[PDB]
Amino acid sequence: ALSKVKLNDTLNKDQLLSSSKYTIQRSTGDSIDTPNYDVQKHINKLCGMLLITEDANHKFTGLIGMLYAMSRLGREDTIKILRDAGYHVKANGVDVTTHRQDINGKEMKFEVLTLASLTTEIQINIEIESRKSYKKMLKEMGEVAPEYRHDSPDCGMIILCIAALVITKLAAGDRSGLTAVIRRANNVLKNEMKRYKGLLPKDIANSFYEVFEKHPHFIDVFVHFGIAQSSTRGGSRVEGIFAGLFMNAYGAGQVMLRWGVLAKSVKNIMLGHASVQAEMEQVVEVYEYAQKLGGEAGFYHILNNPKASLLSLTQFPHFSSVVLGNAAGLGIMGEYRGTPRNQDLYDAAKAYAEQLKENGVINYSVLDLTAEEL
Amino acid sequence: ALSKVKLNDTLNKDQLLSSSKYTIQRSTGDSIDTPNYDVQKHINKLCGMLLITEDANHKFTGLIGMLYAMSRLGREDTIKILRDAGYHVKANGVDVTTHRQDINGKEMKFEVLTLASLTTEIQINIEIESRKSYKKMLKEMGEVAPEYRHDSPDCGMIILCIAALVITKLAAGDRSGLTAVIRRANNVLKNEMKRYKGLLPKDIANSFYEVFEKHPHFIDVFVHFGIAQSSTRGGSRVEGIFAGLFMNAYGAGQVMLRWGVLAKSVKNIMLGHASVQAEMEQVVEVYEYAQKLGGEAGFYHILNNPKASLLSLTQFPHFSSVVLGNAAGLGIMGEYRGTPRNQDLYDAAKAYAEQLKENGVINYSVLDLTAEELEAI
RNA sequence: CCCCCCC
RNA sequence: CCCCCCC
RNA sequence: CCCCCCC
Ligand SMILES: O[B-](O)(O)O
Ligand SMILES: O[B-](O)(O)O
């Protein structure tokens, strides 16, 4: 039978990768700081110091943010996530030590962390500049409220909130999302920006973009932290904001998959086209593959998962075009940098979708109506 | 087939979070007082002291209320709830000690608790001001009845009754509910307010609002206490009031879910609309998800559970609008701060719902009627 | 190669 | 982001 | 909040 002449390449390719007899292990570099729960409070204070600092130097915030996420996971778990990801790790133990240095003649004491990635000389400067901003703040308002200070438990998570926004736009893979990252960091997180002078979306977002670009293993660390954080029973409102923003990243780099379901849901006529119907057998394969993977597939593009390519609908020019057309006709795309391979099908689908948002007839068969006198 | 082109994002997102291989542990701060059952009676007396005090300082009532809830749970269980929630806890043992201090020259004895959160100096002042209010009360009525005194077992739970009302309106997350909290604390809990001069709904409600804002882990403690309390076989009438008020919180921050079932139940015509029908596949996913979670989902918004966002119907502009319309047409909303994304669908649904409350024909097929002679009646 | 919107 | 009523 | 009769 001609029905038997088929080959499920999408499923078979996944099968090949899922059933590997051998494994690779990547060298991360020299050393990774793995802070445990004991150091967590200190990192939160360090995060707060950057947040209180007016016109702060967010060169290290991306890395500091990562340290806080790791301190929440705790040494044991963070090492486990690094090893499970496929990395050879030389773990550096983070401990609190008192450093004595004479700044402006007067000998001063500082509580610093034993970090390889962060110098003790740069750590003291974060505290130095924060104290300047704190005394200026104390001079302006007399007494500083718990909301405006570096001590606040929200501090670490506030920084990680923009990290969740960076992760949201990593699918583009070129820092193009930065504008949207800043925009959203202003709409959401508005109250947080009021309390902290150092909450500079652009500055912090670039720092995280840099850390994820320079250290791709940290993106795996963050994604797994975010999931672990989102597994919690409850928490603060800032922790709720983070969880929401982190979940906005789920399904990034696979918008066509969701827009495809939309086109079906709105019943765009162009889906029934002969050239679109030819692709159907194979488009179902990818949808069934996406269904099979479940939650796992959500962060496939964020973390550069090799199997992310398998979820592409771009390989089907006709279906992608009607899907993209429907999205344009419903006015839901833009400035989406996706181009339709078949222009005629796109234009036809865009036209029908534009006509759909003008009509709308009531389907009385859906409702459980008895004696109708309507 | 085009029927196969689907993706259950709601279910998959939950699956991802439910199957986490790794865990986070949060630092609560420095120390949390974990009082055991032995200290429970003392806290109830302290609660009673604030309740007998005319124009009492309810600055610490939110925290004292939490201590009573923890003393009912008992050290072991409270530590367990804190650890299960995802918090690193340095437990402080609460013990009763006698403190001698000379107030107005005369050396006085006081029974105080070894609390980190509450100073022994502030504890004595609660007792000092209560004694003043007690002697004034003794001068007014001669003999003080068991209902009017601080000794009463209801005291601790009376304070926790307004804590249940605060928890009821935490979904708004901005203290906006305070007006309703006070209002309800007057309708319900009316007899309790008669017996206690210090039962100031506004003052106590703000204290609990503050404690839940400053210490988010305490909201987890309270919710779990409330469930544990509501698991009881029986109790006092005040304990019954609490249980009822605590259960009013179940499903807060998810009113649209319940109003959606209402729209279906009343058979609002606008549900059959083309743009509403397109969303249907996905709206069922969330309803089935809510059905799957069961009782767990009830306090998802109260405790800032990460998965609470997944229960939102706001992501479906058309369905939400008809649901909100039906709620307005039936006159059940207001002043609900929810805005319909599709105005035309809302107005159409509001109109139909208004027409529904005017009609009403009897459906005789529902009843198990045999030989019908009602048409003659 | 894949990706690219909004929230 | 989510939420927001009444009881 | 719930409840509220009779036997
Ligand atoms: O543990 B180290 O090497 O002191 O940082
Ligand atoms: O147990 B403590 O430390 O005495 O309160």
Domain boundary assignment for chain B:
1-377
Say if CB B129 and CB B137 are below 8 A apart.
Answer: no
The position carrying tokens 């670039």 is A206
- 10 Å CB burial of residue B357 (0-12, 13-18, 19+) is exposed
Q: Give CA–CA dist A336/A345, Å, rounded.
A: 18
Buried b (16+ CB within 10 A) or exposed e, B249-281: bbbbbbbbbebbeebeebebbbbbbebbbbbee
**From residues 279-308 of B, which are strand D contacts by CB within 7 A?**
301, 308
Structure letter (DSSP) for residue A299 = G
Q: Give CA torsion, residues B350, B352, B353, B356, to 10 deg.
A: 160
Residues in CB range of B366: below 8 A, 6 or more apart:
none
Nucleotides in D strand less than 7 A from protein CB = 1-7
Q: Please give the structure tokens belonging to residue A83.
A: 């090893």
Q: Is the dihedral of CA B48, B51, B52, B53 positive or negative?
A: positive
Q: Please give the structure tokens belonging to residue A246.
A: 């982190």
Q: How was this structure determined?
A: X-ray
- Does strand D come within 7 Å of the CB of A184? yes
Q: Please give the structure tokens belonging to residue B145.
A: 């009845």
Please report, as a single letter, which amino acid is at residue A175.
R
Say if CB A303 and CB A223 are below 8 A apart.
Answer: yes
Backbone conformation region of residue A55, classed left if phi is above 0, alpha if psi is from -120 to 50, else beta: left
E strands in B225-265? none
Q: Check if B150 contacts A (Cβ < 8 Å).
A: no
Q: Give CA–CA dist B203/B187, Å, rounded.
A: 17
Residues in CB range of A358: below 8 A, 6 or more apart:
none
Say if CB A181 and CB A166 are below 8 A apart.
Answer: yes
Q: If we measure between CA atoms, which residue out of A311, A312, A352, A358 comes closest to residue A328?
A: A352
Q: Check if A331 contacts B (Cβ < 8 Å).
A: no
Say if CB B177 and CB B169 are below 8 A apart.
Answer: yes
Q: Please give the structure tokens belonging to residue A268.
A: 């765009």
Q: Give CA–CA dist B331/B356, Å, rounded.
A: 12
Question: How far is Cα of residue A331 from the mean position of the Cα atoms in its chain?
Answer: 25
Nucleotides in C strand less than 7 A from protein CB = 1-7
Q: Give CA–CA dist B195/B218, Å, rounded.
A: 29
Structure letter (DSSP) for residue B306 = G
Please report, as a single letter, which amino acid is at residue B83.
R
The position carrying tokens 């932290």 is A225
Q: Is the dihedral of CA A102, A103, A105, A111 positive or negative?
A: negative
Backbone phi and psi for residue A221, each to the nearest 5 degrees, phi listed first: -65, -50
Say if CB B222 and CB B85 are below 8 A apart.
Answer: no
Atom of ligand 1 nearest to the CA of A115: 5
Give the residue from B3, B11, B14, B16 with the most A CB atoms within 10 Å of its CB, the best one to mutate. B16
**Overall size of chain A counted in residues:** 374
Q: Give CA–CA dist A330/A325, Å, rounded.
A: 9
Which numbered ligand comes closest to the C-alpha of B32?
A: 2
Q: What is the DSSP string of A86-113?
A: TEE--EEE--EEEEEEEETTEEEEEEEE
In this structure, the number of other CB atoms found within 10 A of the CB of residue B122 comes to 13
Q: Give CA–CA dist B149/A356, Å, rounded.
A: 70
The position carrying tokens 């006159």 is B331
CB-closest option in A37, A80, A359 to B22 = A80
Q: Please give the structure tokens belonging to residue A229.
A: 């954080």
Buried b (16+ CB within 10 A) or exposed e, A322-336: bbbbbbbbbeebeee
Q: If we measure between CA atoms, which residue out of B79, B78, B97, B76 comes closest to residue B88?
A: B79
Residues in CB range of A118: below 8 A, 6 or more apart:
A33, A60, A63, A64, A67
Say if CB A77 and CB A58 are below 8 A apart.
Answer: no
Look at ligand 2, atom 3, and give the residue with the nearest C-alpha.
Answer: B92
Say if CB A359 and CB A269 are below 8 A apart.
Answer: no
Say if CB B11 and CB B285 are below 8 A apart.
Answer: yes
- Whether cis (ω within 30° of 0) applies to the bond prior to A335 is yes
CA distance A131 to chain B (A): 22
Q: Tell me the pairing of strands B87-88 and B26-27.
A: parallel
List A224's β-bridge partners, or say none: none
The position carrying tokens 């200290």 is B39
Q: If we measure between CA atoms, which residue out of B208, B219, B209 comes closest to residue B87?
A: B219
Q: If we measure between CA atoms, which residue out of B140, B245, B133 comes closest to residue B198?
A: B133
Q: Give CA–CA dist A11/A20, Å, rounded.
A: 15
Q: Give CA–CA dist A236/A234, Å, rounded.
A: 7
Q: Please give the structure tokens belonging to residue A310.
A: 């398998």
Q: What is the DSSP string of B121-181?
A: HHHHHHHHHHHHHHHHHHHHHSS--TTTSTT-THHHHHHHHHHHHHHHTGGG-SSTTHHHH
Q: Give CA–CA dist A226/A307, Å, rounded.
A: 21
Please report, as a single letter, which amino acid is at residue B358.
E
Say if CB B35 and CB B314 are below 8 A apart.
Answer: no
List A103's β-bridge partners, or say none: A106
Say if CB A206 and CB B272 are below 8 A apart.
Answer: no
Element spanning A358, H or E:
none
SS3 (DSSP) at B25 = coil
Structure letter (DSSP) for residue B303 = T
Backbone conformation region of residue B253, classed left if phi is above 0, alpha if psi is from -120 to 50, else beta: left
SS3 (DSSP) at A109 = strand
- 10 Å CB burial of residue B247 (0-12, 13-18, 19+) is middle
**Angle ∠(A58,A60,A64) on CA atoms, nearest 5:** 115
Q: Please give the structure tokens belonging to residue A33.
A: 């700081």
Question: How far is Cα of residue A100 from the mean position of the Cα atoms in its chain?
Answer: 39
Say if CB B63 and CB B118 are below 8 A apart.
Answer: yes
Q: Give CA–CA dist B205/B45, Å, rounded.
A: 20
SS3 (DSSP) at B102 = strand
Residues in CB range of A286: below 8 A, 6 or more apart:
A10, A257, A310, A311, A312, A313
Q: Please give the structure tokens belonging to residue B296.
A: 């767990």
Structure letter (DSSP) for residue B5 = -
Listed resolution, Å: 3.3
In this structure, the number of other CB atoms found within 10 A of the CB of residue B231 comes to 8
Q: Give CA–CA dist B22/A225, Å, rounded.
A: 8
What is the distance in angstroms measured between the alpha-carbon CA of B187 and the sugar C1' of E5? 25
List B26's β-bridge partners, or say none: B87
SS3 (DSSP) at A101 = strand
Say if CB B242 and CB B164 are below 8 A apart.
Answer: yes
Q: How far is CA B297 from CA B13, B44, B205, B213, B223, in A?
A: 15, 32, 25, 21, 12
Nearest CA in chain B to A234: B305
- Does strand D come within 7 Å of the CB of B186? no
Give the residue from A224, A231, A320 with the most B CB atoms within 10 Å of its CB, the best one to mutate. A231
Say if CB B86 and CB B26 are below 8 A apart.
Answer: yes
The position carrying tokens 């995280």 is A208
Question: How far is Cα of residue A160 from the mean position of the Cα atoms in its chain?
Answer: 10
E strands in A275-371? none
Q: Give CA–CA dist B306/A241, Å, rounded.
A: 8
Q: Give CA–CA dist B220/B215, Å, rounded.
A: 10
Q: If we measure between CA atoms, which residue out of B62, B8, B28, B77 comes closest to residue B210?
A: B62
* CB of A305 sitting under 6 A from ligand 1: no
